[PDB]
């Protein structure tokens, strides 16, 4: 029940995405607690140190959920520019020409699938391209 | 409870971004305190020296949160003009031609990621460009 103010930085999450759940706690929490939404992307929690505690818990646990990191997957055989059109015809993927490598972005579960699907599209063709040579 | 006036410069933050949280304190603070929003980008706090204290605390702590600094990352191998198109196809980046270097802007956490992602796109290609030479 201790009345205090607390600082919560909101990094990955849009601070107003959290409008419902932080203020809906005030329904249950009652008075004394205030939640502040600043487009400079922090959320200022001022109130009873237990209820703010959860919203340092909730957000910075929820701020984990939307975590988006990028990784460069090289391509030994196929052209990165094809794979960037194909994988984007199914549904963020950007191809780097120089190193022949595909930049991918998403949560670690989505960056699993495209990492398994790019290993098959990079599988080596057997000897037979669209071009063959016939000795007459 | 001392009634005073105080000067708060608001540097990085839009002074009207702080309309909710400074005036919502007046709800809890009560009378005697006044918060002034000047588009010349300061916020004049006149009132009880404890409640203004926090809003010198809050803002100049919040004014830290949106801190945006720029840095020039050189590029030894790749062209800065490519990396400026690629890194901007994922989502501020401006490339400098002469020194072959990319200007980047953002908070120190975002300027971490692009600094790790530019180290891979600058990694040296192994001997094999899009051009090879076949001796027949």
PDB file of C-alpha atoms in Angstrom:
ATOM      1  CA  UNK A   1       0.000   0.000   0.000  1.00  0.00           C
ATOM      2  CA  UNK A   2       3.047   2.294   0.011  1.00  0.00           C
ATOM      3  CA  UNK A   3       2.436   5.427  -2.065  1.00  0.00           C
ATOM      4  CA  UNK A   4       5.431   6.066  -4.362  1.00  0.00           C
ATOM      5  CA  UNK A   5       6.330   7.117  -7.899  1.00  0.00           C
ATOM      6  CA  UNK A   6       8.235   4.816 -10.261  1.00  0.00           C
ATOM      7  CA  UNK A   7       9.945   5.067 -13.656  1.00  0.00           C
ATOM      8  CA  UNK A   8       9.153   2.490 -16.337  1.00  0.00           C
ATOM      9  CA  UNK A   9      10.897   2.827 -19.715  1.00  0.00           C
ATOM     10  CA  UNK A  10       8.840   1.245 -22.492  1.00  0.00           C
ATOM     11  CA  UNK A  11      11.286   0.324 -25.250  1.00  0.00           C
ATOM     12  CA  UNK A  12       9.835  -1.976 -27.923  1.00  0.00           C
ATOM     13  CA  UNK A  13       6.140  -1.451 -27.114  1.00  0.00           C
ATOM     14  CA  UNK A  14       4.065   1.508 -28.211  1.00  0.00           C
ATOM     15  CA  UNK A  15       3.258   3.179 -24.889  1.00  0.00           C
ATOM     16  CA  UNK A  16      -0.358   3.715 -25.896  1.00  0.00           C
ATOM     17  CA  UNK A  17      -0.739   0.054 -26.836  1.00  0.00           C
ATOM     18  CA  UNK A  18      -0.682  -0.396 -23.060  1.00  0.00           C
ATOM     19  CA  UNK A  19      -3.518   2.059 -22.457  1.00  0.00           C
ATOM     20  CA  UNK A  20      -6.091  -0.704 -21.705  1.00  0.00           C
ATOM     21  CA  UNK A  21      -4.217  -3.024 -19.379  1.00  0.00           C
ATOM     22  CA  UNK A  22      -2.401  -0.477 -17.232  1.00  0.00           C
ATOM     23  CA  UNK A  23      -5.462   1.709 -16.698  1.00  0.00           C
ATOM     24  CA  UNK A  24      -7.798  -1.282 -16.330  1.00  0.00           C
ATOM     25  CA  UNK A  25      -5.640  -2.175 -13.329  1.00  0.00           C
ATOM     26  CA  UNK A  26      -6.727   1.137 -11.763  1.00  0.00           C
ATOM     27  CA  UNK A  27     -10.230  -0.339 -11.861  1.00  0.00           C
ATOM     28  CA  UNK A  28      -9.019  -3.151  -9.592  1.00  0.00           C
ATOM     29  CA  UNK A  29      -6.199  -1.201  -7.925  1.00  0.00           C
ATOM     30  CA  UNK A  30      -8.465   1.713  -7.025  1.00  0.00           C
ATOM     31  CA  UNK A  31      -7.069   5.118  -6.102  1.00  0.00           C
ATOM     32  CA  UNK A  32      -3.527   6.335  -5.554  1.00  0.00           C
ATOM     33  CA  UNK A  33      -2.109   4.838  -8.763  1.00  0.00           C
ATOM     34  CA  UNK A  34      -1.504   6.806 -11.958  1.00  0.00           C
ATOM     35  CA  UNK A  35      -0.253   5.562 -15.327  1.00  0.00           C
ATOM     36  CA  UNK A  36       1.324   8.054 -17.734  1.00  0.00           C
ATOM     37  CA  UNK A  37       1.714   7.509 -21.483  1.00  0.00           C
ATOM     38  CA  UNK A  38       4.380   9.651 -23.120  1.00  0.00           C
ATOM     39  CA  UNK A  39       4.982   9.445 -26.899  1.00  0.00           C
ATOM     40  CA  UNK A  40       8.674   9.867 -26.029  1.00  0.00           C
ATOM     41  CA  UNK A  41       8.096   6.170 -25.235  1.00  0.00           C
ATOM     42  CA  UNK A  42       8.178   5.713 -21.502  1.00  0.00           C
ATOM     43  CA  UNK A  43       5.291   5.051 -19.131  1.00  0.00           C
ATOM     44  CA  UNK A  44       5.385   6.809 -15.752  1.00  0.00           C
ATOM     45  CA  UNK A  45       3.791   4.810 -12.939  1.00  0.00           C
ATOM     46  CA  UNK A  46       2.981   6.743  -9.767  1.00  0.00           C
ATOM     47  CA  UNK A  47       1.117   4.921  -7.031  1.00  0.00           C
ATOM     48  CA  UNK A  48       1.111   2.044  -4.587  1.00  0.00           C
ATOM     49  CA  UNK A  49       4.380   0.145  -4.959  1.00  0.00           C
ATOM     50  CA  UNK A  50       2.679  -3.254  -5.292  1.00  0.00           C
ATOM     51  CA  UNK A  51       0.418  -2.398  -8.228  1.00  0.00           C
ATOM     52  CA  UNK A  52       3.152  -0.498 -10.047  1.00  0.00           C
ATOM     53  CA  UNK A  53       5.335  -3.547  -9.378  1.00  0.00           C
ATOM     54  CA  UNK A  54       3.177  -5.712 -11.647  1.00  0.00           C
ATOM     55  CA  UNK A  55       3.153  -3.078 -14.362  1.00  0.00           C
ATOM     56  CA  UNK A  56       6.920  -3.037 -14.224  1.00  0.00           C
ATOM     57  CA  UNK A  57       6.465  -6.819 -14.322  1.00  0.00           C
ATOM     58  CA  UNK A  58       3.772  -6.951 -17.016  1.00  0.00           C
ATOM     59  CA  UNK A  59       5.205  -4.466 -19.493  1.00  0.00           C
ATOM     60  CA  UNK A  60       8.855  -5.493 -19.305  1.00  0.00           C
ATOM     61  CA  UNK A  61       7.629  -9.068 -19.662  1.00  0.00           C
ATOM     62  CA  UNK A  62       5.280  -8.013 -22.474  1.00  0.00           C
ATOM     63  CA  UNK A  63       8.056  -5.839 -23.905  1.00  0.00           C
ATOM     64  CA  UNK A  64       9.864  -9.166 -24.300  1.00  0.00           C
ATOM     65  CA  UNK A  65       6.996 -10.659 -26.304  1.00  0.00           C
ATOM     66  CA  UNK A  66       7.267  -8.307 -29.262  1.00  0.00           C
ATOM     67  CA  UNK A  67      11.052  -8.542 -29.400  1.00  0.00           C
ATOM     68  CA  UNK A  68      12.249  -8.078 -32.986  1.00  0.00           C
ATOM     69  CA  UNK A  69      15.873  -8.789 -33.919  1.00  0.00           C
ATOM     70  CA  UNK A  70      17.524  -9.109 -37.324  1.00  0.00           C
ATOM     71  CA  UNK A  71      20.051 -11.560 -38.700  1.00  0.00           C
ATOM     72  CA  UNK A  72      21.989 -12.041 -41.924  1.00  0.00           C
ATOM     73  CA  UNK A  73      21.730 -15.536 -43.415  1.00  0.00           C
ATOM     74  CA  UNK A  74      24.273 -16.159 -46.199  1.00  0.00           C
ATOM     75  CA  UNK A  75      23.385 -17.988 -49.401  1.00  0.00           C
ATOM     76  CA  UNK A  76      25.930 -20.277 -51.025  1.00  0.00           C
ATOM     77  CA  UNK A  77      23.996 -21.312 -54.138  1.00  0.00           C
ATOM     78  CA  UNK A  78      20.782 -19.423 -54.873  1.00  0.00           C
ATOM     79  CA  UNK A  79      20.691 -15.714 -55.567  1.00  0.00           C
ATOM     80  CA  UNK A  80      19.560 -13.631 -52.634  1.00  0.00           C
ATOM     81  CA  UNK A  81      17.418 -11.497 -54.929  1.00  0.00           C
ATOM     82  CA  UNK A  82      15.253 -14.433 -56.029  1.00  0.00           C
ATOM     83  CA  UNK A  83      14.752 -15.736 -52.488  1.00  0.00           C
ATOM     84  CA  UNK A  84      13.758 -12.211 -51.505  1.00  0.00           C
ATOM     85  CA  UNK A  85      10.964 -12.202 -54.082  1.00  0.00           C
ATOM     86  CA  UNK A  86       9.822 -15.762 -53.401  1.00  0.00           C
ATOM     87  CA  UNK A  87       9.747 -15.529 -49.614  1.00  0.00           C
ATOM     88  CA  UNK A  88       7.922 -12.205 -49.904  1.00  0.00           C
ATOM     89  CA  UNK A  89       5.347 -13.619 -52.309  1.00  0.00           C
ATOM     90  CA  UNK A  90       4.102 -15.887 -49.520  1.00  0.00           C
ATOM     91  CA  UNK A  91       3.295 -12.970 -47.237  1.00  0.00           C
ATOM     92  CA  UNK A  92      10.167  -8.501 -43.550  1.00  0.00           C
ATOM     93  CA  UNK A  93      12.914  -9.720 -45.886  1.00  0.00           C
ATOM     94  CA  UNK A  94      15.569  -7.607 -47.591  1.00  0.00           C
ATOM     95  CA  UNK A  95      18.366  -9.065 -49.701  1.00  0.00           C
ATOM     96  CA  UNK A  96      21.953  -7.823 -49.711  1.00  0.00           C
ATOM     97  CA  UNK A  97      23.572  -8.153 -53.124  1.00  0.00           C
ATOM     98  CA  UNK A  98      27.284  -7.897 -52.341  1.00  0.00           C
ATOM     99  CA  UNK A  99      27.672 -10.679 -49.789  1.00  0.00           C
ATOM    100  CA  UNK A 100      24.792 -12.631 -51.357  1.00  0.00           C
ATOM    101  CA  UNK A 101      22.887 -12.779 -48.104  1.00  0.00           C
ATOM    102  CA  UNK A 102      19.319 -12.259 -46.942  1.00  0.00           C
ATOM    103  CA  UNK A 103      18.476  -9.953 -44.048  1.00  0.00           C
ATOM    104  CA  UNK A 104      15.512 -11.249 -42.049  1.00  0.00           C
ATOM    105  CA  UNK A 105      13.512  -9.767 -39.168  1.00  0.00           C
ATOM    106  CA  UNK A 106      11.037 -11.151 -36.651  1.00  0.00           C
ATOM    107  CA  UNK A 107      10.647 -12.880 -33.322  1.00  0.00           C
ATOM    108  CA  UNK A 108      12.864 -15.920 -32.662  1.00  0.00           C
ATOM    109  CA  UNK A 109      10.090 -18.349 -33.630  1.00  0.00           C
ATOM    110  CA  UNK A 110       9.472 -16.748 -37.030  1.00  0.00           C
ATOM    111  CA  UNK A 111      13.196 -16.448 -37.625  1.00  0.00           C
ATOM    112  CA  UNK A 112      13.263 -20.210 -37.116  1.00  0.00           C
ATOM    113  CA  UNK A 113      10.942 -21.048 -40.005  1.00  0.00           C
ATOM    114  CA  UNK A 114      12.535 -18.822 -42.630  1.00  0.00           C
ATOM    115  CA  UNK A 115      15.880 -20.203 -41.481  1.00  0.00           C
ATOM    116  CA  UNK A 116      14.673 -23.747 -42.211  1.00  0.00           C
ATOM    117  CA  UNK A 117      13.002 -22.756 -45.469  1.00  0.00           C
ATOM    118  CA  UNK A 118      16.085 -20.924 -46.726  1.00  0.00           C
ATOM    119  CA  UNK A 119      18.217 -24.025 -46.151  1.00  0.00           C
ATOM    120  CA  UNK A 120      16.129 -25.921 -48.709  1.00  0.00           C
ATOM    121  CA  UNK A 121      16.056 -23.123 -51.262  1.00  0.00           C
ATOM    122  CA  UNK A 122      19.856 -22.983 -50.947  1.00  0.00           C
ATOM    123  CA  UNK A 123      20.202 -26.743 -51.465  1.00  0.00           C
ATOM    124  CA  UNK A 124      22.548 -27.494 -54.331  1.00  0.00           C
ATOM    125  CA  UNK A 125      21.002 -28.266 -57.698  1.00  0.00           C
ATOM    126  CA  UNK A 126      22.127 -31.549 -59.226  1.00  0.00           C
ATOM    127  CA  UNK A 127      24.136 -30.842 -62.367  1.00  0.00           C
ATOM    128  CA  UNK A 128      20.978 -29.887 -64.276  1.00  0.00           C
ATOM    129  CA  UNK A 129      20.132 -26.235 -64.701  1.00  0.00           C
ATOM    130  CA  UNK A 130      17.784 -24.779 -67.183  1.00  0.00           C
ATOM    131  CA  UNK A 131      20.729 -25.135 -69.593  1.00  0.00           C
ATOM    132  CA  UNK A 132      22.042 -28.406 -70.970  1.00  0.00           C
ATOM    133  CA  UNK A 133      24.621 -29.143 -73.632  1.00  0.00           C
ATOM    134  CA  UNK A 134      23.777 -31.741 -76.265  1.00  0.00           C
ATOM    135  CA  UNK A 135      26.651 -33.154 -78.252  1.00  0.00           C
ATOM    136  CA  UNK A 136      25.161 -34.103 -81.584  1.00  0.00           C
TER     137      UNK A 136
ATOM    138  CA  UNK B   1       4.252  23.465   0.904  1.00  0.00           C
ATOM    139  CA  UNK B   2       6.404  26.511   0.113  1.00  0.00           C
ATOM    140  CA  UNK B   3       4.839  28.646  -2.625  1.00  0.00           C
ATOM    141  CA  UNK B   4       7.491  29.565  -5.228  1.00  0.00           C
ATOM    142  CA  UNK B   5       8.034  29.886  -8.972  1.00  0.00           C
ATOM    143  CA  UNK B   6      10.594  27.761 -10.825  1.00  0.00           C
ATOM    144  CA  UNK B   7      12.161  27.639 -14.297  1.00  0.00           C
ATOM    145  CA  UNK B   8      12.257  24.340 -16.185  1.00  0.00           C
ATOM    146  CA  UNK B   9      13.828  24.311 -19.663  1.00  0.00           C
ATOM    147  CA  UNK B  10      12.407  21.504 -21.794  1.00  0.00           C
ATOM    148  CA  UNK B  11      15.042  20.705 -24.414  1.00  0.00           C
ATOM    149  CA  UNK B  12      14.425  17.457 -26.313  1.00  0.00           C
ATOM    150  CA  UNK B  13      10.750  16.998 -25.382  1.00  0.00           C
ATOM    151  CA  UNK B  14       7.846  18.772 -27.018  1.00  0.00           C
ATOM    152  CA  UNK B  15       6.520  20.912 -24.165  1.00  0.00           C
ATOM    153  CA  UNK B  16       2.931  20.016 -24.997  1.00  0.00           C
ATOM    154  CA  UNK B  17       3.749  16.306 -24.965  1.00  0.00           C
ATOM    155  CA  UNK B  18       3.917  16.894 -21.211  1.00  0.00           C
ATOM    156  CA  UNK B  19       0.439  18.414 -21.024  1.00  0.00           C
ATOM    157  CA  UNK B  20      -1.120  15.284 -19.416  1.00  0.00           C
ATOM    158  CA  UNK B  21       1.380  14.350 -16.735  1.00  0.00           C
ATOM    159  CA  UNK B  22       2.267  17.802 -15.432  1.00  0.00           C
ATOM    160  CA  UNK B  23      -1.336  18.987 -15.229  1.00  0.00           C
ATOM    161  CA  UNK B  24      -2.594  15.621 -13.953  1.00  0.00           C
ATOM    162  CA  UNK B  25      -0.288  16.258 -10.996  1.00  0.00           C
ATOM    163  CA  UNK B  26      -2.391  19.353 -10.225  1.00  0.00           C
ATOM    164  CA  UNK B  27      -5.236  16.890  -9.686  1.00  0.00           C
ATOM    165  CA  UNK B  28      -3.207  15.284  -6.889  1.00  0.00           C
ATOM    166  CA  UNK B  29      -1.173  18.378  -5.977  1.00  0.00           C
ATOM    167  CA  UNK B  30      -4.260  20.571  -5.662  1.00  0.00           C
ATOM    168  CA  UNK B  31      -4.035  24.358  -5.724  1.00  0.00           C
ATOM    169  CA  UNK B  32      -1.073  26.714  -5.766  1.00  0.00           C
ATOM    170  CA  UNK B  33       0.776  24.953  -8.599  1.00  0.00           C
ATOM    171  CA  UNK B  34       0.745  26.109 -12.221  1.00  0.00           C
ATOM    172  CA  UNK B  35       2.354  24.484 -15.259  1.00  0.00           C
ATOM    173  CA  UNK B  36       3.069  26.628 -18.323  1.00  0.00           C
ATOM    174  CA  UNK B  37       3.644  25.277 -21.837  1.00  0.00           C
ATOM    175  CA  UNK B  38       5.497  27.639 -24.153  1.00  0.00           C
ATOM    176  CA  UNK B  39       6.164  26.655 -27.796  1.00  0.00           C
ATOM    177  CA  UNK B  40       9.519  28.414 -27.342  1.00  0.00           C
ATOM    178  CA  UNK B  41      10.148  25.061 -25.611  1.00  0.00           C
ATOM    179  CA  UNK B  42      10.342  25.640 -21.899  1.00  0.00           C
ATOM    180  CA  UNK B  43       7.800  24.754 -19.226  1.00  0.00           C
ATOM    181  CA  UNK B  44       7.300  27.267 -16.407  1.00  0.00           C
ATOM    182  CA  UNK B  45       6.406  25.676 -13.073  1.00  0.00           C
ATOM    183  CA  UNK B  46       4.995  28.016 -10.430  1.00  0.00           C
ATOM    184  CA  UNK B  47       3.792  26.482  -7.194  1.00  0.00           C
ATOM    185  CA  UNK B  48       4.686  24.485  -4.117  1.00  0.00           C
ATOM    186  CA  UNK B  49       8.394  23.670  -4.253  1.00  0.00           C
ATOM    187  CA  UNK B  50       7.873  19.947  -3.599  1.00  0.00           C
ATOM    188  CA  UNK B  51       5.481  19.262  -6.475  1.00  0.00           C
ATOM    189  CA  UNK B  52       7.477  21.377  -8.911  1.00  0.00           C
ATOM    190  CA  UNK B  53      10.516  19.442  -7.674  1.00  0.00           C
ATOM    191  CA  UNK B  54       9.183  16.203  -9.161  1.00  0.00           C
ATOM    192  CA  UNK B  55       8.339  17.897 -12.436  1.00  0.00           C
ATOM    193  CA  UNK B  56      11.893  19.143 -12.599  1.00  0.00           C
ATOM    194  CA  UNK B  57      12.674  15.519 -11.718  1.00  0.00           C
ATOM    195  CA  UNK B  58      10.186  13.859 -14.083  1.00  0.00           C
ATOM    196  CA  UNK B  59      10.768  15.933 -17.202  1.00  0.00           C
ATOM    197  CA  UNK B  60      14.553  16.178 -17.042  1.00  0.00           C
ATOM    198  CA  UNK B  61      14.539  12.436 -16.403  1.00  0.00           C
ATOM    199  CA  UNK B  62      11.998  11.938 -19.202  1.00  0.00           C
ATOM    200  CA  UNK B  63      13.944  14.417 -21.336  1.00  0.00           C
ATOM    201  CA  UNK B  64      16.724  11.835 -21.028  1.00  0.00           C
ATOM    202  CA  UNK B  65      14.501   9.058 -22.372  1.00  0.00           C
ATOM    203  CA  UNK B  66      14.029  10.523 -25.834  1.00  0.00           C
ATOM    204  CA  UNK B  67      17.691  11.449 -26.197  1.00  0.00           C
ATOM    205  CA  UNK B  68      18.704  11.314 -29.865  1.00  0.00           C
ATOM    206  CA  UNK B  69      22.374  11.548 -30.865  1.00  0.00           C
ATOM    207  CA  UNK B  70      24.067  10.884 -34.199  1.00  0.00           C
ATOM    208  CA  UNK B  71      27.256   9.071 -35.108  1.00  0.00           C
ATOM    209  CA  UNK B  72      29.272   8.396 -38.250  1.00  0.00           C
ATOM    210  CA  UNK B  73      30.157   4.733 -38.800  1.00  0.00           C
ATOM    211  CA  UNK B  74      32.788   4.231 -41.526  1.00  0.00           C
ATOM    212  CA  UNK B  75      32.557   1.450 -44.095  1.00  0.00           C
ATOM    213  CA  UNK B  76      35.714  -0.273 -45.286  1.00  0.00           C
ATOM    214  CA  UNK B  77      34.238  -2.630 -47.889  1.00  0.00           C
ATOM    215  CA  UNK B  78      30.594  -2.094 -48.825  1.00  0.00           C
ATOM    216  CA  UNK B  79      29.327   1.087 -50.410  1.00  0.00           C
ATOM    217  CA  UNK B  80      27.565   3.401 -48.010  1.00  0.00           C
ATOM    218  CA  UNK B  81      24.871   4.090 -50.595  1.00  0.00           C
ATOM    219  CA  UNK B  82      23.769   0.447 -50.762  1.00  0.00           C
ATOM    220  CA  UNK B  83      23.683   0.021 -46.981  1.00  0.00           C
ATOM    221  CA  UNK B  84      21.605   3.189 -46.833  1.00  0.00           C
ATOM    222  CA  UNK B  85      18.976   1.659 -49.111  1.00  0.00           C
ATOM    223  CA  UNK B  86      19.028  -1.775 -47.482  1.00  0.00           C
ATOM    224  CA  UNK B  87      18.852  -0.600 -43.878  1.00  0.00           C
ATOM    225  CA  UNK B  88      16.062   1.796 -44.846  1.00  0.00           C
ATOM    226  CA  UNK B  89      14.094  -0.922 -46.621  1.00  0.00           C
ATOM    227  CA  UNK B  90      13.618  -2.659 -43.269  1.00  0.00           C
ATOM    228  CA  UNK B  91      11.902   0.352 -41.729  1.00  0.00           C
ATOM    229  CA  UNK B  92      16.952   7.533 -39.803  1.00  0.00           C
ATOM    230  CA  UNK B  93      19.963   6.665 -41.963  1.00  0.00           C
ATOM    231  CA  UNK B  94      21.816   8.979 -44.338  1.00  0.00           C
ATOM    232  CA  UNK B  95      24.951   7.967 -46.224  1.00  0.00           C
ATOM    233  CA  UNK B  96      27.950  10.216 -46.815  1.00  0.00           C
ATOM    234  CA  UNK B  97      29.617   9.530 -50.152  1.00  0.00           C
ATOM    235  CA  UNK B  98      33.046  11.122 -49.740  1.00  0.00           C
ATOM    236  CA  UNK B  99      34.283   9.363 -46.614  1.00  0.00           C
ATOM    237  CA  UNK B 100      32.192   6.275 -47.424  1.00  0.00           C
ATOM    238  CA  UNK B 101      30.409   6.394 -44.101  1.00  0.00           C
ATOM    239  CA  UNK B 102      26.852   6.062 -42.838  1.00  0.00           C
ATOM    240  CA  UNK B 103      25.293   8.659 -40.552  1.00  0.00           C
ATOM    241  CA  UNK B 104      22.882   7.074 -38.076  1.00  0.00           C
ATOM    242  CA  UNK B 105      20.491   8.555 -35.510  1.00  0.00           C
ATOM    243  CA  UNK B 106      18.569   7.174 -32.547  1.00  0.00           C
ATOM    244  CA  UNK B 107      18.727   6.338 -28.874  1.00  0.00           C
ATOM    245  CA  UNK B 108      21.795   4.420 -27.649  1.00  0.00           C
ATOM    246  CA  UNK B 109      19.952   1.085 -27.768  1.00  0.00           C
ATOM    247  CA  UNK B 110      18.881   1.473 -31.403  1.00  0.00           C
ATOM    248  CA  UNK B 111      22.318   2.751 -32.334  1.00  0.00           C
ATOM    249  CA  UNK B 112      23.582  -0.536 -30.912  1.00  0.00           C
ATOM    250  CA  UNK B 113      21.674  -2.774 -33.317  1.00  0.00           C
ATOM    251  CA  UNK B 114      22.491  -0.927 -36.525  1.00  0.00           C
ATOM    252  CA  UNK B 115      26.093  -0.849 -35.326  1.00  0.00           C
ATOM    253  CA  UNK B 116      26.090  -4.655 -35.059  1.00  0.00           C
ATOM    254  CA  UNK B 117      24.216  -5.116 -38.325  1.00  0.00           C
ATOM    255  CA  UNK B 118      26.560  -2.809 -40.229  1.00  0.00           C
ATOM    256  CA  UNK B 119      29.568  -4.832 -39.063  1.00  0.00           C
ATOM    257  CA  UNK B 120      28.217  -7.880 -40.902  1.00  0.00           C
ATOM    258  CA  UNK B 121      27.273  -6.008 -44.058  1.00  0.00           C
ATOM    259  CA  UNK B 122      30.826  -4.616 -44.078  1.00  0.00           C
ATOM    260  CA  UNK B 123      32.361  -8.081 -43.668  1.00  0.00           C
ATOM    261  CA  UNK B 124      34.847  -8.782 -46.427  1.00  0.00           C
ATOM    262  CA  UNK B 125      33.656 -10.845 -49.369  1.00  0.00           C
ATOM    263  CA  UNK B 126      35.785 -13.894 -50.112  1.00  0.00           C
ATOM    264  CA  UNK B 127      37.487 -13.439 -53.474  1.00  0.00           C
ATOM    265  CA  UNK B 128      34.205 -14.044 -55.315  1.00  0.00           C
ATOM    266  CA  UNK B 129      32.238 -11.079 -56.570  1.00  0.00           C
ATOM    267  CA  UNK B 130      29.567 -11.124 -59.150  1.00  0.00           C
ATOM    268  CA  UNK B 131      32.490 -11.160 -61.611  1.00  0.00           C
ATOM    269  CA  UNK B 132      34.793 -14.099 -62.228  1.00  0.00           C
ATOM    270  CA  UNK B 133      37.492 -14.663 -64.809  1.00  0.00           C
ATOM    271  CA  UNK B 134      37.545 -17.986 -66.643  1.00  0.00           C
ATOM    272  CA  UNK B 135      40.736 -18.900 -68.427  1.00  0.00           C
ATOM    273  CA  UNK B 136      39.654 -21.096 -71.295  1.00  0.00           C
TER     274      UNK B 136
END
